[PDB]
Design a protein around this ligand. Sequence first.
Ligand code: HEC
Ligand code: HEC
Ligand SMILES: COc1c(O)c(C)c(C/C=C(\C)CC/C=C(\C)CC/C=C(/C)CC/C=C(\C)CC/C=C(\C)CCC=C(C)C)c(O)c1OC
Ligand SMILES: CCCCCCCCCCCO[C@@H]1O[C@H](CO)[C@@H](O[C@H]2O[C@H](CO)[C@@H](O)[C@H](O)[C@H]2O)[C@H](O)[C@H]1O
Ligand SMILES: CCCCCCCC1=C(O)C(=O)c2scnc2C1=O
Lengths: 431, 62, 55, 385, 125
Amino acid sequence: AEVTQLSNGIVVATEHNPSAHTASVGVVFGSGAANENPYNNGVSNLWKNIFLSKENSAVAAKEGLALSSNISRDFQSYIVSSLPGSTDKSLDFLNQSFIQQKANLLSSSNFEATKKSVLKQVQDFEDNDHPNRVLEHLHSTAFQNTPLSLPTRGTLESLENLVVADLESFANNHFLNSNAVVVGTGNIKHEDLVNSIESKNLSLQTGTKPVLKKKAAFLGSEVRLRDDTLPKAWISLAVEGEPVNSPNYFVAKLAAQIFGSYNAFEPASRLQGIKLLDNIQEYQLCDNFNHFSLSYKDSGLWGFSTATRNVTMIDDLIHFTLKQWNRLTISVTDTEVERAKSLLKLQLGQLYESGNPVNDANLLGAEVLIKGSKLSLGEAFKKIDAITVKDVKAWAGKRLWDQDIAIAGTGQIEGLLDYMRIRSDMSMMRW
Amino acid sequence: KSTYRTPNFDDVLKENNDADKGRSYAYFMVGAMGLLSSAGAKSTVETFISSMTATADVLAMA
Amino acid sequence: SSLYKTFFKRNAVFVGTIFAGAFVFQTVFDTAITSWYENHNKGKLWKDVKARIAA
Amino acid sequence: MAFRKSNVYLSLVNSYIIDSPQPSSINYWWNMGSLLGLCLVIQIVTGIFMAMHYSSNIELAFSSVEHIMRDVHNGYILRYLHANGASFFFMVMFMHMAKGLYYGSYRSPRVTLWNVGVIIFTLTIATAFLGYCCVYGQMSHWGATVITNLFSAIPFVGNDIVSWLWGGFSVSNPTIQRFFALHYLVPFIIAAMVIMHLMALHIHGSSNPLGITGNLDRIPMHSYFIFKDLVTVFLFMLILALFVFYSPNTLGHPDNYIPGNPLVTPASIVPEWYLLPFYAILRSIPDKLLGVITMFAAILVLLVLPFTDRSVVRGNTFKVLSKFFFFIFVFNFVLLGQIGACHVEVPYVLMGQIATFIYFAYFLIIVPVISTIENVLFYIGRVNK
Amino acid sequence: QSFTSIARIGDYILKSPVLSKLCVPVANQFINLAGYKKLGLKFDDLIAEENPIMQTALRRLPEDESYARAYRIIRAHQTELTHHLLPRNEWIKAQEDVPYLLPYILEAEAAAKEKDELDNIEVSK
Ligand code: HEC
Ligand code: HEC
Ligand SMILES: COc1c(O)c(C)c(C/C=C(\C)CC/C=C(\C)CC/C=C(/C)CC/C=C(\C)CC/C=C(\C)CCC=C(C)C)c(O)c1OC
Ligand SMILES: CCCCCCCCCCCO[C@@H]1O[C@H](CO)[C@@H](O[C@H]2O[C@H](CO)[C@@H](O)[C@H](O)[C@H]2O)[C@H](O)[C@H]1O
Ligand SMILES: CCCCCCCC1=C(O)C(=O)c2scnc2C1=O
């Protein structure tokens, strides 16, 4: 449970955990899809794909190393996993690919074979992964004409028109030092890694900063992707949430836990202590749903997602759910808040502490990049337990009560009523 | 075209410097409509009811 | 309009405040009208004629 | 499908009168409903034809009814039909209501059905009364006076509501004319209410004498019950005929053949027979305000029955204690009526007071107590441990 | 009134030899005067079913009992409409008049009551 981080030339961050069996090293950049443009959208996803290409991947495999990378909105990360002993051979492969081979990975035979893969990849996504496709579109309309609206995997149109020069252009503007953090998780010590790094000098484009832009903003709107040939209806709905490093980051995350997630087929799920289940189970209004409090640097999204085959009662699904959310402003109970506290701790635990160093790396790098440090799991619990009913009520009265929303859906959505109908349910009549 | 590229709404959108601008106007409008409607309903109801009170020709003081 | 946000603060006007305002309006408006009306017809009314009479 | 099923208008008729699934075992007590519709029609038809010859002015009302009696061809048939029809309307309504009481028709899931029925009963009382005032006989005038004064019991504004209702200093020409206008209006509100009654009946269907489900054995309304309804419709007409032609004034009051007089109230006032039980209840309370409140409560208490019936089975068919007490309630009601026709004298006043007590106690004490006891008896008579 | 409540009172009386000898004979006389047995019905057949508890109960009832309940109810309606009673040798005997649905009704009520309790549990820190 130690968050160690020191700066010499490069800001090095590590979180050691003795019993681990393995160790992971890599760099995480403070720039992701939210830094691209509508036309070069998909560059970051492309980088990730070449970094994992058959050529580069075969080199580290001989050495007994494994590769992993993830593209997000605010950040990007390249990671190399290894045994606790080869904690040095990872640092060689890292520098070899980001300085020496930052021109060998971009050959006219590799880039074309990779481009052909992300194209079949992103296409496959839009053709079949409906729930994620919808959540991606939710960000698209909620933050339109603003950074957060750009899909992480990029659009098929900005992708097929992307050239090697664009990769370089992006890389030379974001893969800088002042916008980077070298992460090390697994078992290796902070002082073990920091030495192998402060050994090899060379700055490589120092003093350079990435370009700036215009702040992200929420806009009440919707995008309806009707498709009557699909067998279900997938919809996502949300209000403007909380950004990371916000006084209410936790109240919000707790508020989502109150309604939580559900799966109509799993017996135990049907028994949960969520009032909403009394309303939706009578006529079986949906196969599943899940609330969330997504947070980013400039903004966030608080809402839920759901999938259903009861295409003639979608208005009741949406109506009941939004009536429950009304309660957070006027009648949420102590026991509901308490049930949430326990469950939030359990999930926040399983995330920050799993048996996989790669997840730890991403989380560590991402956090240190936005707030210059990581909040310890124990420090979180103290904040979570401190939340009162009054807090939830004040938060909801600001974020949920009579506030614009964003909607997105695909499939048999004829039954999803108009905007103003849904919008009206964000409140209740009173004397 | 890509569904992620949201069409232009610039002509319709209000340059948000005052977020609660349209809300204040709409709510005032609805409120004034409710005010005048209630006054009218009250006057109409009173008009019908008072038509059942004693007529001018029967209030003779014997 | 910040003039609205001072009295109602981003919420609509409630029935009670509507009904209350309606009762106030009904009286104020009626006086304003009866006044303007009688002034416009000054000299033609019985009030005015009664003064010019002495019995 | 058949045309009767597909046509927008015919399907309504088909679902309510032709294909409606009825419990195979319902008895003749279930025939009162149709008889009530028939009564409603007879009242509306004969009323409109007489309205053609009636004058509402206080100086002409009484004589215009005499004009209907002496000059209008078949006029006396119209008046005696309308008048005797009102009485028959109540005889049948009480049986309809009593049938519901006995079989637990008021129980869930037919509460809405029962509540709408209470509203109809109130509207019917109001309608008959207004009609009664249109004759403008001696009873008419005083009835119009008493019932409108009932509102003065309300504190503060009460006497105002009254002078308002009268449209003047006393029951006069503005009163009787508004009463006629109102007597014509209300029957159409009853009709609309009767439709809502039927809508509520259609969602769960009729109950049956066994008090259990009818879902395992139903037979079509058409043929079986259409023809069974015909049996009582004709019997109903035969009896009404006997009064209309052979004894037209037996259910009326001689004082109504005397024009209303503002200065003289008859030495002996006996209201309409169907109002007597309520008249007795009113008279039994030596306080003005409490007197009218208790009378109105005698009607509203019908609303309480779905909650005070603690039983686990519907109806009194298989219940010894409940059947017995059901009849105490019935004859207590008749007694109240008999007391209402007597003078406020010694043995009667106390009898009236006790009967009133018993009436309310049935709903609030006897039913809940008895039904609980019966529940337990049913249990301990079969469980062996 | 719930069956849990009916059982509480009924069992208390049934155990105490004071009331058990005083009441049961009256109850037995009551049941015979009711006459439902002459129609081929068992008391449990008479319970009003239009509520969730009874619907759950009838749903859990094993197949063979269900077909039998059905035959008894239909047979009852037919006799009633003919204004007769079944021939005495067809009447339900006291040994047969068993509370077969009762165990399902009580189980459902407890399940229901628990849920009501759990949905409203307060918490003391
Ligand atoms: C205009 C249509 C009209 C309708 C609809 C109507 N009536 Fe009448 N009613 C009259 C007229 C006209 C009189 C006066 C003539 C008379 O005394 O019969 C009257 C008189 C009465 C009387 C006095 C009877 C008597 O002793 O003379 C009663 C009671 C009555 N109506 C009951 C009813 C009931 C109950 C209904 C309906 C369910 C009804 N009326 C519907 C017109 C109507
Ligand atoms: C205070 C109660 C009450 C009043 C008054 C009432 N009803 Fe009903 N009615 C019922 C109930 C309860 C039922 C259900 C009977 C059952 O299935 O056990 C019913 C059923 C019916 C039925 C179905 C057949 C039957 O008789 O059971 C008809 C038709 C009907 N009512 C017509 C009417 C009409 C027409 C009126 C009067 C204008 C009326 N009712 C007034 C309570 C009432
Ligand atoms: C589930 O169980 C049921 C059941 O559902 C039903 C429906 C019935 C059958 C009974 C009924 C349907 C009764 C229904 C009664 C009505 C709908 C009455 C509606 C009433 C009215 C008064 C209609 C209004 C009439 C008019 C406006 C016109 C009259 C005036 C005229 C014609 C004036 C003409 C003028 C000139 C100058 C010629 C049962 O017996 C039954 O038992 C088991
Ligand atoms: C026919 C006779 C006519 C009588 C008068 C007409 C009706 C007037 C009703 C007036 C006010 O009724 C009032 O409406 C506003 C909506 O505008 C309601 O407001 C509700 O919705 C608004 C809008 O999303 C929310 O901001 C608010 O927090 C919420 O309470 C308010 O709670 C209710 O009290
Ligand atoms: C449910 C309403 C019951 C009506 C009760 C009022 C009964 C009633 C009186 O109390 C009365 O003093 C006179 S004088 C002439 N008619 C009446 C009459 O009907």
